[PDB]
Each structure stands twice: as C-alpha cells, then as structure tokens.
Design a protein around this ligand. Structure first.
Ligand code: UMA
Ligand code: A1AQS
Length: 438
C-alpha cells in the first residue's frame, strides 16, 4: 500500500491509535486523530504536530477522509462511521495496515477464552526453535509495533472487533478456539454476529484449526480440506485420559504427558493442543514446540496464584472478562473449604445464568460489585453480598476466610466501569490480598 498524499483519519486515542499515528508519520503521512471520549488516555502522548479532536466524532474530518483507520474500540455501527461507509470511504483497522506490510507468515488466533495463552504458547514454541518471532495484537502489544524486517514469524491474538475491520489477512494458520457470549453491547444481532466476525480469520488461511467440541468454530460451509481439529475425546489433536494421567495425542500417537506441563486444567490441555496444531502448520519443529509446553508457566491475571498463606490461596483471574472464562475457572475447581468468589464490573449485556450451576452447595460465597453487581448477586441471593467496589468486597470477605478456603477474583465482566483495565483490577486485588491475607 502507498498512503502518500492521502487524507488519513484515525479514530481512537488509545494504544492502537497512538501506534497508528506513529506508523503514518514514519511513512511521511500526517494523520488527524479523533476520539469520542472527552479525555482519552493517549492524549498526553500524542505528538504535538498531529491535529486532534475529542469528545465526539468529527464528521467534517470523516467525510473528507481518503482512509479512516478505526481502533477496535469504536463500533463500525456508530452513525458517523456508518455514514462514511455509506459514502464509500475506505475503513480499515491497525491489523489490516499490519497485514499489508508484514513480510513473514502470520499465525492468527481468536476465541472467547484461551487466545492469549495459545498466542503466547505459539510464540514460546517459535523461540524454542530459534525463530525470530513477533507476538502481539489484542494481547497488548499493538501489531504495528512488531513490524521488523528480521522477523521470521508473527503470532497475532485477534479480537472480533479487530477482525471486523480486517480484509487482507492470509494466515499460515488460523484458529477460533471457541465461541461463547461476549461483547453483546457491540453485537445487536447477537451471538451469530459475534461469530461472523471471528469467522473472518479463516478467509484465505492456509490451515484452519477448529475445535471439534465447538461447532461455532467451524466455517459456515463446514470443515474443508484446510481444516485440522483439536478436541477432548476426538479430533486430529486430542487428549487420552487414563488412571489419573492425561496425554496430548496427535493422530493416535502420544506426544506429551501433561504432568510435564506447568499449566493444568482440561481447557489448558486443549489450549496446548491448539498451539501445537498451529505451530505444526507454521512449520515449527515438533521437538522444540513440545519443550515450550513444559516451560510456560502462565500469564499474569489468568488464574494466577498471587498469595498462598495460612492455608488459603488468593487467585487473580482478573482476565476472566466473560462468562465462559469464569466457567473455565469454576468447572472442575477443587476447594477444601469455602470458595469466596468475586464477581462484578461491566457485564457487557451478558447472561450470567450459566454460572449458577457451579454455585450450589454449602461451600460457596459470592461478593458482587461494580456496575452489574446486583445481577450477579441474583445468581444465588442467599450466599451473595453486594458492594460498590472490589475493595469493599475484599474487606467484607477477608474476616470470613478460613484455612482451606480459596479467594477467587474471576469476575465474568470487563473492568472498565471502575478500572483502567483488567490488569489494574488484578494488581489491586493482589495488593489487597497481601494486606488482608498475610
Ligand atoms: C477494547 C479493545 O479492543 N482494546 C484493545 C485495543 O486497546 P486500545 O487501547 O487501542 O483500545 P481502543 O480501541 O482505544 O478502545 C478502548 C476503549 O475506549 C473506548 N473508546 C474508543 C474510541 C473512541 O473513539 N471512543 C471510545 O469510547 C472503547 O469503547 C473502549 O472501551 O488494542 C490493543 C492492542 O491491539 C488491545 O490489547 C486491546 O485489547 C484489550 C485487552 C481488550 O479489552 N480487548 C477486548 C476486545 C477483549 O479482549 O475482550
Ligand atoms: C443461522 C444464523 O444464525 N445465521 C446468521 C448469520 C449472521 C448473523 S449477524 C446479522 C444478521 C442480520 C443483519 N442485518 N444487519 C446486520 N449488521 N446484520 N447482522 C445472524 C445470523
């Protein structure tokens, strides 16, 4: 692509928008930037020479643009952005800009849960093989910052939002790990509209890696000659369970006894399968890929033990921003005493009812906070308490914690109503756990 001389308008003054500003300036194009927020976070980091507009979308700028670059946080359905599309003005996102420039193969990963773990695993498999790898996207390092003529493989975590604005991705290997309700505040045509965004990841992919146990991860025309599957009891990549022992298997052959992994839980074993399938499709050597599965210890804020003291584990699962992610934490969870479960934040219009079946019995207490705290407490009112904030909830539960108990922050909601992001929520939880638990 050649952007010289074009009128380029960027929407969003977050991490993505700032990376796009730098991308265009480095190519001799001065963009303009706007954001609907009155005081967006990147305002102070924006170079002084770049014109900016805040507090609304500016139609004078959008309707004059040759190219609109939309951050994932702005809906294409915004009336001003929809008006620009109606006029035939080209709209792309940062991932599109990246794909147009990338000079190495791309592994592309989406899904409602597991995507950062799988993305990081594939990156570790590449590193173990001695491959110069760039890992980024929705995981938190904007993709345009990865561009490097020495990079030999890119591994991108992609959201549904990013995929909506991407048209030129031709992944060497692509997966949808699973599809469960999320972002319904952005998808007024429901689960299938969200799914449709994710299905874009398979377009022009050389290999598609699908979940044999989740039919919504399959292309609408069905699985085809490009499709490799993973699953629990079936799939090209699957699990074999025996007497307290689980193996990763590929087409009937054992490849790894999961006792060698540092992650645990069935969903992390299927994450390992998906990562291996992607790595195999990208041509990475099997032996080094298996080694990486044994060295990876997990991501911050993803079922992370932040304190184990006095017989109590305090677990930061702040990255559980949807119901399916909290279900993965709860399903199969063993607690000797009482589970003190922190739920709350901005639920994004989700139905929380799938969580109720994990919340029966006498050894569970709920502490519900944030915007949707009342809806979460309604899952089982007789064991639930509601506060405004997570700190209030933690100070309420801490006196009740007994040896053998678990305190689990797995909130099923976004943090943006009260926190900068899920990392700040997790860091605040960890600080409070250390104060209250030691
Ligand atoms: C919301 C989203 O898609 N965030 C991803 C984005 O971060 P960035 O800081 O660029 O976000 P953004 O596009 O500026 O939007 C952030 C917030 O600002 C709001 N916003 C944005 C632009 C605007 O004009 N008005 C406005 O109100 C959005 O509604 C959103 O709540 O780009 C980063 C780099 O690719 C990602 O790491 C980050 O993923 C975060 C982790 C995330 O929450 N992603 C969602 C999709 C998820 O995982 O569920
Ligand atoms: C079998 C099934 O459920 N298929 C399906 C596929 C896509 C959608 S999403 C959609 C549908 C209409 C529409 N009109 N305008 C917009 N933006 N949309 N989006 C829903 C259902």
């Amino acid at each position: 692509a050649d952007y010289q001389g074009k009128n380029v308008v960027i929407i969003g003054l977050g991490l993505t928008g700032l990376s796009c500003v730098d991308f265009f300036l480095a190519r001799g194009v001065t963009p303009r930037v706007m954001d609907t927020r009155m005081t967006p976070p990147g305002l102070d980091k924006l170079p002084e020479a770049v014109e900016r507009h805040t507090g609304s979308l500016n139609d004078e700028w959008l309707m004059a643009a040759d190219l609109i670059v939309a951050s994932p946080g702005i809906a294409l359905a915004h009336p001003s952005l929809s008006a620009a599309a109606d006029a035939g003005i080209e709209i792309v996102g940062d991932i599109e800009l990246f794909c147009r420039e990338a000079q190495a193969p791309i592994v592309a990963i989406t899904g409602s849960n597991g995507k950062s773990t799988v993305t990081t695993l594939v990156g570790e498999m590449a590193k173990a093989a001695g491959v110069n790898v760039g890992v980024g996207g929705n995981i938190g390092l904007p993709a345009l910052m990865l561009l490097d003529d020495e990079c030999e493989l890119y591994v991108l975590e992609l959201s549904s939002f990013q995929l909506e604005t991407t048209s030129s991705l031709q992944a060497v290997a692509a997966t949808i790990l699973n599809v469960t309700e999320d972002h319904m505040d952005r998808y007024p045509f429901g689960l299938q509209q969200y799914r449709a965004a994710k299905l874009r990841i398979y377009e022009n992919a050389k290999v598609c890696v699908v979940n044999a146990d989740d039919a919504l991860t399959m292309p609408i025309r069905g699985a085809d000659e490009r499709c490799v599957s993973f699953g629990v009891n079936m799939g090209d990549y699957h699990l074999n369970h025996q007497q307290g022992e689980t193996w990763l298997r590929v087409k009937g052959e054992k490849v790894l006894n999961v006792k060698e992994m540092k992650l645990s839980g069935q969903h992390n074993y299927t994450n390992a399968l998906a990562a291996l399938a992607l790595a195999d499709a990208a041509g990475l050597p099997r032996a080094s890929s298996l080694k990486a599965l044994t060295t990876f210890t997990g991501l911050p804020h993803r079922f992370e033990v932040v304190l184990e003291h006095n017989g109590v584990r305090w677990i930061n699962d702040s990255k559980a921003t949807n119901v399916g992610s909290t279900e993965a934490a709860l399903n199969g969870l063993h607690v000797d005493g009482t589970l003190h479960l922190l739920l709350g934040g901005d639920g994004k219009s989700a139905d929380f009812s799938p969580l109720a079946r994990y919340l029966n019995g006498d050894n569970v207490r709920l502490y519900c906070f944030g915007r949707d705290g009342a809806q979460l407490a309604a899952l089982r009112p007789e064991v639930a308490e509601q506060t405004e904030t997570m700190e209030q909830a933690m100070r309420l539960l801490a006196p009740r914690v007994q040896p053998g108990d678990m305190v689990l922050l797995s909130p099923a909601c976004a943090s943006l109503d009260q926190f900068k992001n899920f990392e700040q929520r997790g860091n605040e939880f960890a600080r409070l756990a250390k104060e209250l638990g030691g």
